[PDB]
Design a protein around this ligand. Structure first.
Ligand SMILES: O=P(O)(O)OC[C@H]1O[C@](O)(CO)[C@@H](O)[C@@H]1O
Ligand SMILES: [Mg+2]
Length: 464
């Protein structure tokens, strides 16, 4: 369209996307090679599995060099489409963008395509078809969040009786809503000052207020209040008892844990009656949640080698066990449901979460999501897909940036730590201010303030 900006490109000079494509992608692929080598160390050095692994390693090496060499992105072969169940969308994109190469291609398509090429290598090898080359990293990162994991578990156990009372009914509930929304937002970047308040009394205290203010000072667009209004009004409605909340997930580990905590909080307080979680169907963007990552999380909570909370009788051990158990209970009763869909791992932006997307599940998902009271989109990549990853002016109205999602009947909330060039909905002058501030310690990269992960946005749309 004449006034819709183009998408960020791997050749947009001076952008974080350009840096990502030229510098970060080769590192991620080399890391995968190294993690495959690491896994190899734990198995026999011959046989179909070991040999298949050596071959994947060699292909990953060549793939990394392809990115460095900036070669044209090739279509998936018919064999690859069949054996690895690749969506047909990629090849249609490539037909419409002839001879695009790593050196000059849309950042969004190419990043998604990168993980697809990696996954095809695994799916071809029978002994590796379900192996997650990012699992070692996912697990190591979550392992290192022990202190925060325990603090939140302690908090859940402490709050449980009070949440029940609240469900039986509020201004204290609003404070907790902000906390759980913000912890979900920041994920493993959450400061301990927020987490160390593990009782209602500590959360309401001066200390709690200061922690929330510190967090909120970095949330430059903050529509938390709008989501609060939606759920409280739904809870107060004399008619219709079902309150459905959806999570379009981002990272595994602590972020997924914080999302589960937010869901548990909503369920126990009456702000939700059912939460549905939407995961990726292949290893993706390194850390992104797959269905199996939820099972692994629950197992981790109970694993006293992984989370060494001490003898089973510590407050710490009991709280971890309690939460794992709660997760199993919620899944069995259907209060929490996990789903995966190939749509989330295609190149399609979320302007395709619309009835007009009739080929790759977009219309199917849109129709179902219309039924949600609140669809929460987690993290940066989801925000990129909501906005088309386009070069919008940074003051662009949120409703404009999200295209048909402004008017097609989905009520949405983006919780985005800012980690990419795309940025919209800012107040006049704010970009210049933050850019000047960030320019001090990052000469020539002031505009990268919204790529640093230090700031965040919380953006709401009614879908009407
Ligand atoms: O995990 P998130 O929040 O989706 O962030 C993904 C990060 O990786 C990127 O895809 C760049 O490689 C950006 O979206 C962001 O910097
Ligand atoms: Mg991610």
């Amino acid at each position: 369209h004449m006034t819709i900006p183009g998408r960020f490109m791997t050749i947009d000079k001076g952008t974080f996307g350009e840096y990502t494509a030229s510098t970060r992608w080769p590192i991620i692929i080399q890391n995968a090679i190294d993690d495959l080598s690491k896994h190899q160390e734990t198995e026999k050095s011959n046989g179909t599995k070991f040999e298949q692994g050596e071959v994947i390693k060699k292909e990953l090496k060549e793939f990394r060099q392809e990115i460095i060499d900036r070669v044209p992105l090739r279509p998936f072969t018919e064999e690859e489409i069949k054996i690895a169940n690749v969506p047909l969308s990629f090849n249609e994109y490539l037909k419409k963008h002839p001879e695009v190469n790593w050196g000059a291609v849309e950042w969004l398509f190419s990043e998604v395509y990168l993980y697809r090429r990696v996954n095809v290598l695994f799916q071809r090898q029978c002994e590796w078809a379900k192996f997650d080359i990012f699992n070692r990293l996912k697990q190591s990162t979550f392992e290192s969040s022990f202190y925060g994991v325990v603090e939140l578990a302690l908090r859940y156990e402490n709050l449980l009786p009070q949440l029940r009372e609240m469900k039986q009914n509020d201004d204290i509930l609003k404070v907790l809503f902000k906390e759980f929304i913000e912890i979900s937002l920041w994920g493993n970047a959450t400061d301990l000052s927020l987490l160390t308040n593990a009782t209602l009394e500590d959360i309401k205290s001066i200390q709690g207020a200061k922690a929330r203010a510190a967090s909120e000072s970095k949330i430059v667009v903050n529509d938390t209040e709008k989501a609060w209004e939606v759920l409280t009004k739904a809870r107060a409605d004399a008619n219709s008892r079902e309150i459905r909340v959806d999570f379009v997930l981002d990272n595994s580990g602590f972020e997924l844990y914080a999302d589960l905590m937010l869901a548990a909080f909503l369920l126990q307080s009456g702000l939700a009656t059912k939460c549905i979680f939407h995961a990726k169907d292949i290893p993706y963007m390194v850390s992104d949640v797959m269905l199996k990552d939820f099972d692994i999380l629950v197992h981790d909570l109970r694993d006293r080698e992984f989370f060494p909370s001490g003898e089973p009788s510590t407050k710490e051990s009991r709280a971890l066990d309690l939460f794992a158990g709660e997760m199993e209970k919620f899944v069995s009763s259907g209060k929490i449901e996990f789903r995966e869909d190939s749509f989330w791992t295609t190149e399609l932006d979320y302007w395709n979460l619309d009835a007009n997307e009739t080929k790759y599940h977009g219309s199917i998902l849109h129709k179902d999501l219309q039924k949600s009271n609140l669809v929460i989109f987690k993290g940066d990549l989801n925000y990129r897909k909501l906005t088309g990853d386009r070069k919008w002016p940074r003051t662009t109205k949120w409703e404009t940036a999200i295209g048909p999602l402004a008017t097609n009947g989905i009520t949405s909330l983006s919780l985005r730590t800012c980690k990419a060039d795309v940025q919209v909905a800012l107040p006049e002058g704010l970009d210049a201010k933050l850019s000047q501030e960030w320019e001090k310690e990052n000469p020539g990269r002031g505009s990268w303030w919204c790529c640093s992960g230090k700031w965040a946005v919380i953006c709401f749309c009614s879908g009407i």
